Amino acid sequence: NIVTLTRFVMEEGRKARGTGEMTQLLNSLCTAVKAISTAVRKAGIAHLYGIAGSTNVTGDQVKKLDVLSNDLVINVLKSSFATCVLVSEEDKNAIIVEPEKRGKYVVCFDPLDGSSNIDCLVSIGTIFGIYRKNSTDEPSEKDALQPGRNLVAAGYALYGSATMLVLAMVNGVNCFMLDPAIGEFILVDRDVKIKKKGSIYSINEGYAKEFDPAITEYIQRKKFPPDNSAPYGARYVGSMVADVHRTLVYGGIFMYPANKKSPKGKLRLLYECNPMAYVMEKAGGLATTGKEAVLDIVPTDIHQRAPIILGSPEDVTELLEIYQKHAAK
Amino acid sequence: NIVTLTRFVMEEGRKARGTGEMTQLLNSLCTAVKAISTAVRKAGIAHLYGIAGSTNVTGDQVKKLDVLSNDLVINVLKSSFATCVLVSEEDKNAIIVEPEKRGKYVVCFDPLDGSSNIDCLVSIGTIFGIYRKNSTDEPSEKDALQPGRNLVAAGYALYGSATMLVLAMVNGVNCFMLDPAIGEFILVDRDVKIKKKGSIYSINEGYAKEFDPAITEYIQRKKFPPDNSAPYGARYVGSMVADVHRTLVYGGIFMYPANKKSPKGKLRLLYECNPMAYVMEKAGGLATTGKEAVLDIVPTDIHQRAPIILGSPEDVTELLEIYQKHAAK
Amino acid sequence: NIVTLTRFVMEEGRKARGTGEMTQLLNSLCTAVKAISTAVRKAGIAHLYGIAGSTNVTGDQVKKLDVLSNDLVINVLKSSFATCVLVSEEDKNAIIVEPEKRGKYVVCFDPLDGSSNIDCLVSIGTIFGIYRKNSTDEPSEKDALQPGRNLVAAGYALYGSATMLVLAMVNGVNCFMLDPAIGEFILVDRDVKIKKKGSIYSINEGYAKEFDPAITEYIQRKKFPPDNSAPYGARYVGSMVADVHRTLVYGGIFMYPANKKSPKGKLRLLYECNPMAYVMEKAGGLATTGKEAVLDIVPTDIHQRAPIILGSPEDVTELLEIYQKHAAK
Amino acid sequence: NIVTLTRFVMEEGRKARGTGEMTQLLNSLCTAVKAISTAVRKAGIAHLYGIAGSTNVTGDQVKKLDVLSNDLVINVLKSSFATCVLVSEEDKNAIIVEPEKRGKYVVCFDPLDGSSNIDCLVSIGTIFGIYRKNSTDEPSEKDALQPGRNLVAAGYALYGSATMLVLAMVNGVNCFMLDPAIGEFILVDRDVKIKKKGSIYSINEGYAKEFDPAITEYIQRKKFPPDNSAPYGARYVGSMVADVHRTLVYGGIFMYPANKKSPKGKLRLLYECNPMAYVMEKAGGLATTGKEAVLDIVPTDIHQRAPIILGSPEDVTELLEIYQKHAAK
Numbered sequence A, B, C, D: 001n002i003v004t005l006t007r008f009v010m011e012e013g014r015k016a017r018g019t020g021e022m023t024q025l026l027n028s029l030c031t032a033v034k035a036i037s038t039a040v041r042k043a044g045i046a047h048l049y050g051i052a053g054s055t056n057v058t059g060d061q062v063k064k065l066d067v068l069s070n071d072l073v074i075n076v077l078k079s080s081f082a083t084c085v086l087v088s089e090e091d092k093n094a095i096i097v098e099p100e101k102r103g104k105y106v107v108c109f110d111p112l113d114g115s116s117n118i119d120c121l122v123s124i125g126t127i128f129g130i131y132r133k134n135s136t137d138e139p140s141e142k143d144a145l146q147p148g149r150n151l152v153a154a155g156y157a158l159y160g161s162a163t164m165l166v167l168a169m170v171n172g173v174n175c176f177m178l179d180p181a182i183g184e185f186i187l188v189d190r191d192v193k194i195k196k197k198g199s200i201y202s203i204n205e206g207y208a209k210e211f212d213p214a215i216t217e218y219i220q221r222k223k224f225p226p227d228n229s230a231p232y233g234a235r236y237v238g239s240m241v242a243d244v245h246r247t248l249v250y251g252g253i254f255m256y257p258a259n260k261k262s263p264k265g266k267l268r269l270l271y272e273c274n275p276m277a278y279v280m281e282k283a284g285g286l287a288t289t290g291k292e293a294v295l296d297i298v299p300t301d302i303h304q305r306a307p308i309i310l311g312s313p314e315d316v317t318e319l320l321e322i323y324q325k326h327a328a329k
């Protein structure tokens, strides 16, 4: 039978005999994602260009998509009464939910990942990671400073040619396609597993002058295979959500290592690296900084950055072995 | 004064004192693009997954997006009664329109550009080029073998985070955003001009082992600028329509040179190279094979391939100079 | 804060400490209603008229809206795993849900009320009534033969100028507007109460020659008020769902008494009369046959018909008093 | 061969060898109707209920549907550069188009017909009538005071279960169904003709005490046929556009005669009576005040009211005969 995300989450909540708080949280997230998707596809843009004249608005209201997306996630999540602490890629400080709407979950999210791709209409998305508050003390940012291994759920919504929500939980990864005609996420790929080895590598090679020797050696190997096999194809959309999703469904490797401007990597641990690392591991893939598992890093800053290498097991392992080789010399 | 694509096309037609065929042709194209966009965004996918049970469908009908898009363009274009010859990236032979629906225009198109990106939901699109039938004899594939310089109109529809139709004609390039709420393309960027020089290079570096010396030297300059300026950023979505659109709005350079498997490049002259070269030149950019202007190539086969380098004039000119350097002596 | 139907039902299910079966049932109903609404608004009709040619369909598939709506409700309800017996206005026999998807709820529904108004595009809708199975015996039609007073939930979806779902439960009536942009039902009217007295009467006067003396006297009073007040306005859309909804929000009276062709009334007790009678009483209105409360009738036939008079308390009471007056002579 | 309203309008324009103003005018009307339809179906209502919090709106902007619809028609029509005078049911004075956007057509319209039905979600619509400016002097309200017989085009958009645009011109009436998925009006019924005799009568019988003897006798015949034939069914949605549309597709009669408060009828001649009378006559129906043809009335005020009886020729003729009967002697 057909399974909607709403039914899927409701059923999962009944299997774990939960209070239904996670269910309400996920339902709220779904609503936020649909609202963001409709805005991203520019529904109603004609009004902004004066189709009905200029009488409605009486001042400023041309809210950018990134700001709107952040507002939607924050407002819809608070209204779920299932959260206590929120960490957004767009906010310098953690948001502490009011007692009246306070729940037990901590949510770290990137409302509209792929800032540089917004104006050129390339794929963008929303990334999220959910933790259970493990403290009796008053909620604070410390509750969001948990290693990714502690995630109870993570995933992303990709606003690409079509909108898809990928949800990973303890039991596995599932993909739901948004049917905009009825505003329903339809389960189309169950218990997804990434290919053991891919044929695509994804990295911004513009930083080549600053890559460490391991990354450098690896890329050279993708272009000039020592076994004389066909070189890997290259793909770099520029939005983490898009490149990671392709990595999941096609296999291969995604990399954002450290460079001069970003000595500890560019991508953020809480709402970029951990969520994707969790999705990858639940799908049978790997996620490493090149020296340690991303999910095992205990953060000390909600906006902490980290180098990341993720994707097909055999591909990530080959790169890890290069790092280990250099360290053994 | 909001301007819809319908109004824009209608006006341009009344100024050129044209009969009205081009206007009808463009109106038809717009209709086809909206139908493709809705299908690409997966509207109604719930029905394919049995939301209403299995009673309506009595056999096969799970038509893939590329085939559906091709069917939409061919059917909608024929219904315009403004075309006589159609060349599709999906069909081996040129399509000759029946006398009953025969018009004076020749249309070369790529129904759903970015085949490899369809399944991973990355941006895809539709590319088109329109020619006026020159000869007076019976229409045939030869009517589609005109140099791009002869184009009367060209452009593309990008099904990205939002859907946009970019239309280039004799007087310039205009960008229309599709407002899915009312099925109207809204003029949002008029007489667009590409920046003289960008800071992004776009190419599949997986073919590095097979690049000619000029491409190789150029890429080395983007990563290790000889004058110690800032290295360029890299972006390669993998769908020509998406990479070219970003090149248009952000500036920079897009390249798909020849390699071992594709000795004369991979991209097709009639419905990929020429349309984009026309958009670029009308926007103040350049489009070359590295040795000659794309628009001046005399096509000898409807599915002829050609190497292509396009984008900001200063970036393309620099690469042209390198080719000259490696051609001297 | 904003409240979606999904959150509303989820919260209600948590307050009654239910197993979550009713919640899954209502969520499924919402999905079905959205699917019916999109079909009713004719989304995708262009495909039926050959926009993409004729290659997809390979036979018959032009399913009428009433049949499609029935298929959607049946399939989506069965998939909720919350029902055991279904009674449809379109099916001669009660549907007994398979053991594997069997739940404890009985649902009586009118998939697309207002058959005569379908082709002229006048408002139509879906009516539903939900009962708890009160028997340990194998599920059968007998489980649907309960008086309306036993309903646990009832309501309707109106596909009018906009789509609205009206849900009545033990605690009251709430109205949710469907926002088609995001596929979400938004709570817009809470704990709705009908006006004590209205100024509109709704009945098909074409049957005047067959009305009983009470109905006849009442209508004459609406046109020629004995107190010389302004006569009531008349409205009869022809679809019960539309006329009843207006009665609820504007007040007044709706009537479908017995006539020659329909000696026991035309409207069906299980999926037309009871659901609307329940909504009315929960909103402070009344629903009578003219001699007894609709909700107190113990049915003996799943397709049993009944005369019905419903709406504002003072209006229905005035008509009841006429019936009582005649019976006292 | 699917036919869109855009193509139909374009073709009709190229056949009449018209300049293109009417085509531009109709294209603009279509755009306005789609924008009104989307607003009527409540797309985006979630934003009004705080789904994204309260940060975007900085004041009043909760524009009611009737005002918004009026703004859409006026603005979109002006942008067509094809009109010089506009008369709206919502505005006391005629609107004179600025010389810069001044065209040759005069448009009389009812932006959102069915005011009383807006809040209860019953069908509503937009009615329009188009005239060609006759005189050569400065445009004024007088240019809108032409008898309906002078109309060059008229029709309406019905926002019912689905949205449909009915367009009547010199050669006939055509019905286009709006496919909201692609924002295209699809021709579904060509050269429509009303049945010679129907079996439905439509009138607000609440004014029975004030009806003239002819209307009274006629209604008595519909309920108690003198020849003992089957009584007619009654239907009165309450929105002229909806009742008239049903009359067109199902046949029968629609009436709004004079009463005490409305001695010359309630419906307005310029944008309600004339447009519908034109549609009716082009469909083989009739439209009379009971004493004269509606289309032959010489308007003396832009908001002049007139009694109207329209529909199937045999039904209207019967009522005309009754009026003659009560006029003899």
Ligand SMILES: O=P(O)(O)OC[C@H]1O[C@@](CO)(OP(=O)(O)O)[C@@H](O)[C@@H]1O
Pocket (backbone or CB within 6 Å): A113, A114, A115, A116, A117, A204, A238, A239, A240, A241, A256, A266, A267, B233
């Ligand atoms: O431009 P570069 O340095 O490649 O960085 C792109 C990466 O950073 C991110 C961070 O969100 O994009 P962006 O800064 O444009 O928002 C990721 O989406 C993406 O993977």
Ligand SMILES: O=P(O)(O)OC[C@H]1O[C@@](CO)(OP(=O)(O)O)[C@@H](O)[C@@H]1O
Pocket (backbone or CB within 6 Å): A233, B113, B114, B115, B116, B117, B204, B238, B239, B240, B241, B256, B266, B267
């Ligand atoms: O996979 P590579 O060799 O980079 O080729 C991608 C290029 O070819 C095209 C040809 O259409 O993609 P694809 O073959 O996947 O359809 C272009 O869209 C794109 O620019």
Ligand SMILES: O=P(O)(O)OC[C@H]1O[C@@](CO)(OP(=O)(O)O)[C@@H](O)[C@@H]1O
Pocket (backbone or CB within 6 Å): C113, C114, C115, C116, C117, C204, C238, C239, C240, C241, C256, C266, C267, D233
């Ligand atoms: O045509 P009449 O006899 O007025 O009956 C209309 C009534 O019957 C119903 C029954 O569903 O319509 P219909 O038979 O056209 O489906 C109700 O919707 C409506 O109230």
Ligand SMILES: O=P(O)(O)OC[C@H]1O[C@@](CO)(OP(=O)(O)O)[C@@H](O)[C@@H]1O
Pocket (backbone or CB within 6 Å): C233, D113, D114, D115, D116, D117, D204, D238, D239, D240, D241, D256, D266, D267
């Ligand atoms: O309420 P009554 O007097 O029946 O008037 C309804 C008639 O008037 C109109 C005038 O537009 O409705 P309304 O005043 O509610 O806008 C017509 O749509 C309709 O036919």
Ligand SMILES: [Mg+2]
Pocket (backbone or CB within 6 Å): A089, A110, A112, A113, A114, A115, A240, A272
């Ligand atoms: Mg990001």
Ligand SMILES: [Mg+2]
Pocket (backbone or CB within 6 Å): A089, A115
């Ligand atoms: Mg950022």
Ligand SMILES: [Mg+2]
Pocket (backbone or CB within 6 Å): B089, B110, B112, B113, B114, B115, B240, B272
């Ligand atoms: Mg292509």
Ligand SMILES: [Mg+2]
Pocket (backbone or CB within 6 Å): B089, B115
């Ligand atoms: Mg191909």
Ligand SMILES: [Mg+2]
Pocket (backbone or CB within 6 Å): C089, C110, C112, C113, C114, C115, C240, C272
């Ligand atoms: Mg019914």
Ligand SMILES: [Mg+2]
Pocket (backbone or CB within 6 Å): C089, C115
């Ligand atoms: Mg029926």
Ligand SMILES: [Mg+2]
Pocket (backbone or CB within 6 Å): D089, D110, D112, D113, D114, D115, D240, D272
């Ligand atoms: Mg009106």
Ligand SMILES: [Mg+2]
Pocket (backbone or CB within 6 Å): D089, D115
């Ligand atoms: Mg009014």
